[PDB]
Structure formats: C-alpha cells, structure tokens
Amino acid sequence: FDKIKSKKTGIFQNLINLLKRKTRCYLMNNSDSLIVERVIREGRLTTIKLQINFIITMPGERNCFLPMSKISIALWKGGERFNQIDLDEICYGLIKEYGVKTGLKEICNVCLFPDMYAR
Amino acid sequence: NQQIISVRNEIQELKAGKDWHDLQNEQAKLNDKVKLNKRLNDLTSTLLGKYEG
C-alpha cells in the first residue's frame, strides 16, 4: 500500500510537470484525481476540460489480499460530457499501448490539443 | 495400419505450431489497432466539429 501510494503520487506529479505551463492543472479529491484544461480556439473561447482518477483500494473482499489501483478519465467540451464508454476504451487502449505514464501524457495530448492536431 | 497412424500424427502436429498461434495473436492486434484508430479519429473530429458521425 505504501509503495503503491508513492507510485500514484509519482504518476500525478509527472503529468502535472508535463502539463503545468501549457495548461494549468489542479489536483483535487485528497490527491486522488486531477483536472486539466485548455481553451479551444475553433469556437470563440471554447473550453475543453479533462480530469483523471487514480484510486487505490485496500483489500478485504472479492481474488487476492493486496492493495490494487484503478484508472479512469473524464472529458468535457464546453461543459458537455463526452460519452464515457468510448472515452474509457480510449483510456484502456492508449494505456495498454504506452503504459500509464506515456499513455496518460498522450491522453492529455489527444484531448487538450486536437486543434493543432487535425493534420 | 501404417497410413492411419501417419495421418493422425500429422493432425496432432499441425495445431500445436508456433505460427498457428502467432497469426491469431497478430490478427487480434490488427483488430484492436484499427478500432483504436477509428475511435481516435472520431473523437478528435468531435472535439473539432466537422464530425459527420
């Protein structure tokens, strides 16, 4: 549990470092989830909002007896939440391809920087 | 009696090969990658309008 908490904080701090100056970002929920944000220029001051979760669960009930962790993400454009099934599968695939570290940095690249990215 | 044993041995030999496993794993990877590309293109367009779902 101690080492996994340390790793959790490490992943968050690395993401914060990779995003801090280009997009200010707010760790919240007693260090469990963080928020990032950029203003889309397609529309006049169109905002895009993303927040991520890394929850650690202590054992006791239903497979093993060890502490284990979970990742999930959420996205909004203009306050409008995007359907969570496809977003979760995106999180799943990109994390599996690039791990949590580079995978989540790249999730933020996708979600907070599409306008650059169209081609 | 010889021929039956020979053909049975060939039948057993075929399905345990490395290539038979590798091709299926590769096909699964292709399917995953194409689905991921579809989803990424769809969502980035949705972020940028001009989406035409």
Next chain:
Amino acid sequence: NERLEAILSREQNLLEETRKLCMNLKTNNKKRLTEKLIQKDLHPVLNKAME
C-alpha cells in the same frame, strides 16, 4: 480392410480442410495490415505504436 480405407479418407479430408485456414489467415492478415491502417487516415498518435 475397407473399413480402414474409409477411416483413412475421413482423416485426410479433415486434415485438408484444416490446412487451408492457415493460408487464409496469412493472406487476410497481410491485406488488412497493408490497407486498413497504412492509408493516410491513421491517427498520428498511433504512429509510435505502429513503428
């Protein structure tokens, strides 16, 4: 003896119909790789995983 002939024929036909699927899968995989995710619609994200 003729019963054994029949058994031999059965094993041979099932062997052949199982054999063809390997070539089917190989060609299908090659074609799908070369067309579906090599054309220019690839999301530049997956460029790293693809290389």
Next chain:
Amino acid sequence: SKARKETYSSYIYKVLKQTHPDTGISQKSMSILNSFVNDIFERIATEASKLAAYNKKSTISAREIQTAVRLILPGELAKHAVSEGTRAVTKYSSS
C-alpha cells in the same frame, strides 16, 4: 508373531489317501486326528518310562514300549499294535 506349530496332518491325509483315495478331511476332523497321536504318544511314553523306573533300569527301550502298549491298550487292539510294532522295528533293524 506366530511360531510354526507341530502337526501330523500331512501324514494323516496321506494314509487316508492310501485307504480311501477319493476322500477328503474336514478341518475339525484333522485337528481331532492331530490330537489323537499326541495323546496316545504321551499316555504310552509316561507309562513306559514309569515301568522302566519300576525295573530300576536306566534305558527306555523297545521291550519297555512293547510292554507299555500291551498294558494300556485294550487287548484286541493291543495284539495288532504289538505285532505291527515288532514287524516295523524288525524291518528297520534289517536295514
């Protein structure tokens, strides 16, 4: 553990084969006939050596056994017994 037990059952069965070749023996009957010979052996030998002690002679011998058997057996069986003992010992000494 269990030590090997003395028995005459093989000889009893063999003499029954000589008498009635087609006949078998029950286990209880075989124990009975195994006890027969030991009982007779004792009640002959004790009387014979007691008679030897009456003679005040050291050796228990053929005459003592002959006298003991002819004392203790009923007479009709005793005649056969002494005749068979005498002919058996004679056949032996003729070796």
Next chain:
Amino acid sequence: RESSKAAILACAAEYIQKLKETDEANIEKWTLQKLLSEQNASQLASANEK
C-alpha cells in the same frame, strides 16, 4: 548442438533457408517505416506551420 551428421546437415539446410526467408521480411519492413516516419514528419510540420 546437433550430434549426428545427418541431423547436422538437415539443421544446416533449415537454418540456411530460414536466414534467406528472414532477410526478405527485414527488407520489407523498412519501406513501411519510411512511410510512417515521413507521414509523421509531414504531420508535425503542418502542425508547426498552421
């Protein structure tokens, strides 16, 4: 580490043809790599200029 001479010859032939087969695929992969790399470079240059 084969021992018998016949096994040695068979393994040598198999190894030879396997090397020959591997070379062609190794050659083929590079063209796809070139395509992907130039596509990524062009995409990034378009990103920079736009």
Next chain:
Amino acid sequence: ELRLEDNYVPTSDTLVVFKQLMKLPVTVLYDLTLSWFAKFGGSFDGDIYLLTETLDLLIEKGVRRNVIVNRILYVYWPDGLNVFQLAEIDCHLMISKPEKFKWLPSKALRGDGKPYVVKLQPAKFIENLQTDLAKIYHCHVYMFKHPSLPVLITRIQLFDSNLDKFQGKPLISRRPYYVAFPLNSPIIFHSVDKDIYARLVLQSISRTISERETIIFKPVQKIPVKSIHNIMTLLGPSRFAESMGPWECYASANFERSPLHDYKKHQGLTGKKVMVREFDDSFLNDGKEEPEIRRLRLEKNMIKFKGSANGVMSRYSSLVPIEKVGFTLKNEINSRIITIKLKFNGNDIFGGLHELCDKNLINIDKVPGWLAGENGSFSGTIMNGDFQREQ
C-alpha cells in the same frame, strides 16, 4: 463394439506363464486365487468355503508352490486364464520387482510452447482411450495406482487373430506396453519400445487427453531409466527436480525449521564446523597424516558429490544411480573452438568418480558441477558455463 470384457480367454504358451507365476510368494497366490474364484468361480466343485478350507489345509501342511501353481493351471482353470488375470500377474510382478523395468520421459506441450499440466480423472480418460483405440485394434486396458507413489499406471495390450490354425478362434497375444501419469505435472512416463503399436498407443493418449485444447508430446531424453521410483524422483512433481546433486538439501528442507521454533535450539546459536579450502594447485605434485583433517577432507568429497555432510542418500551410492552420461565441452581458446566429449558407463558414474576422488586420483576443487551430478540424468552440451540439454 470391439471393446473386450473380462470373461474372454486369450491363447499363449503355458510354460512361459508358469515361469512368470513361480516368482510370486504363496500368500499372494492364495489371495489372488480366492479373489478369482469369488468373481469368476471355477471348474472345481464346492463352495468357496470348501475352497477356503482346502487351500488352508494345503498351506498348513507346508505344501510347495509347485502344487498350487499346477492346480491353478490344470484343474481350477485348465483351459487358460482370463485377460484380467494376465494383466494382474504382470501388475504384481512390476510392484514386486520394479528395477527389472525401463521407462522413458515425455513432456506434454500446448500451442504456445508452455508446459501443459495434465490433470486427469481416470473414467473419462479410460473410456475415451478405449473408444479411440478400438476402432483400429482390439485393446484391453487396465489401470491402477502404485502402492507407494502418487502415480497412476496403465497397461495396454493389443491382440490380433491368426503357422496356420482351424476354427479354434483364439486371439494371439503380443508384448505389452505401459504408461504412467503423475497427479500434477507436465511429464509422462512410458515404456521403451519403438514398434508401430507403441506409436499408435502413445498417439492415442495424446489425442484423448486434450478435450479442450490441442496437446503434443515432446521427448526430453534419449536414454531410458529404470525403477519407476527413480524416474518419479527425477522428473515427477517434487522438490528434488531442479535441485539435484549438491542441491539436494533444499529438497530435503529439514535444515530449516519454522520461525516460531524455540530460540535456544535454533541452530544459529549452536552453529557447525567446516574445512578451509586450498587454491594453489598442489594436487598434481603429490603416511605423514593425522585423522581429523582427513575426516573433513572425506566430508568435503561427500558434500561435493552428495550435498550434505551426513551424506543424504555405502558412502558412494548416490540418490538416483546413473548408468550412462555423455558430455561435450565447447570452449574458445585463441579464437579457436575446442571439443572434448567424455563418455562414462557403469552402475553409478558419480559414485565411481567420488571413489576416485577419495583415492586422490581427481582434484575435488576442479570438478565442475555438471561432472559432480547436477543436471542429473541429462546428457548435454556445456557452453558459457551453462548446461544445455542435448536435443
């Protein structure tokens, strides 16, 4: 359809089976024959109790084994015994004299190259194997567990019809074949024969075990092994496998006791004693000696060839004696590769080498592990200081 049943009678030579029967003691004969009459009866007239008292009175009179064997072969079952009894006698022979039989190992593998831990319920296996084999040959199969090991053993025998003969209609026998299965391991043990019948058999086991995913058998060794105990020790699911030779004490695991064990008798306080080694090579150079240092020299040889000072199993007999091993060293000198191939033969190679070490013909400190006995029963090539089993 063609599956046989226990009441059928095969044909064979009577004298050979008589000689086979003579190996067994009297008591097992009594038990086997009582069971046979109980299940099948016999030509003899009388109740089993009558049979019981006849057999009894025969044995307390001290009759010889020949009488009982002749009775069995000529009055009780004069025309010949059933296939079941023929299998049973061989079962008892194997159990009584295990060292007379030879085995080979075989490893079960699945598609991805992983070991396939075979787990077997006997009923499904036996019915499936019988149905698979009956379509090609007439087969009787008998299955049993070893009295003192966690192994299931199977005996397979094949029959065919008829040199010339009229309408007697028997089926002539053939040399049997054997297979064994440990409870939870990827390994299979089977007899040493390469006739097409054995190939058909082994192929049938490989076909029938699967039931959910394909399975194939890959041999791991080319030289047979005797004494099913030994091959079980070497390759069965156990602690000794991959801890052989100098590494046996971990398989024993008695050196260490559980942590909550008492303090004062924990061996750490008490310790032990050992001998100091010497490294400048004085061996080839050359009673002027005293007991204690010689004692610990012998202990050094003991552990180098046995792994424990007390010498966990004479002082030379090893855990599993090895009859043959072939090694092949490959070393690089001045960019030139050099081959040395050693071949040993005997009843216990490493015990003999240990004896030579005791007689001081070989230097202990320069005996490598592969020569000492680790990788036991595996002939192979050594490169880069790492053993590699021969293909």
Next chain:
Amino acid sequence: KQRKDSHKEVERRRRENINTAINVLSDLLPV
C-alpha cells in the same frame, strides 16, 4: 532368387540417405 537382409544391402540404404542429405544441402549453395 536369393533372400537375405544383412551386410552388402543394409549399408546401401544408409549411404543413399546420407547422399540425399548431401544433395539437398548442395542444392541451396550459390554454386
């Protein structure tokens, strides 16, 4: 004719098999 399976024929099969191995190896050579 003469029936026999011993020396003078059993070695021929071994020689032929090794020769075929040599031939298949040689077929792959550049020259």
